[PDB]
Amino acid sequence: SGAIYVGNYRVVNRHLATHNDWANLVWEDSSRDLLVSSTTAQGCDTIARCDCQTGVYYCSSRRKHYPVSFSKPSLIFVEASEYYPARYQSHLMLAVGHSEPGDCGGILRCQHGVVGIVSTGGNGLVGFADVRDLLWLDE
Ligand SMILES: NC(=O)[C@H]1CCCN(C(=O)Cc2cccnc2Cl)C1
Ligand SMILES: [Zn+2]
């Protein structure tokens, strides 16, 4: 679990979005595993606007943060799960690191701010849904 709170927006993994997220829907993209909903309270997480390929992510299944080197956002094949059929997930960045399903939503950050959230994993790899291209999150 986990979300990014920026301005009047909440960014979560689309497969973990709640009834309240869908009732206050701003934007969603199944191909990216992202959903953004509106909030009444002001959020002040800050989004990175950069091309960093190193950062630190939070891994809830270890209660620890790990440093990672990660690939540029790209279209990556993701195996079928109970949430989606087998498909290409876009804007996904992979790194070598630990993750379990419950780790989705953990933030990846660089020195500039939030980069993305854990979205996929397996076999010692972890994948992060990038949010740096969503300029409207802080217009
Ligand atoms: N973005 C998706 O399609 C994910 C939906 C939930 C399921 N997905 C996973 O990858 C779950 C997983 C398995 C083993 C280690 N880490 C993780 Cl995060 C895929
Ligand atoms: Zn950066």
From Swiss-Prot:
Residue numbers binding Zn(2+) 1: 50, 52, 110, 112
Substrates-to-products reaction catalysed: Selective cleavage of Tyr-|-Gly bond in the picornavirus polyprotein
Residues the record marks as active site: 15 (for protease 2a activity), 33 (for protease 2a activity), 104 (for protease 2a activity)
Entry superkingdom: Viruses
Subunit structure: Homodimer.
Function: Cysteine protease that cleaves viral polyprotein and specific host proteins. It is responsible for the autocatalytic cleavage between the P1 and P2 regions, which is the first cleavage occurring in the polyprotein. Also cleaves the host translation initiation factor EIF4G1, in order to shut down the capped cellular mRNA translation. Inhibits the host nucleus-cytoplasm protein and RNA trafficking by cleaving host members of the nuclear pores. Counteracts stress granule formation probably by antagonizing its assembly or promoting its dissassembly.
Protein name: Protease 2A
Native source species: Coxsackievirus A16 (strain G-10)
Boundaries of the shown chain within the full protein: 869 to 1007 of 2193
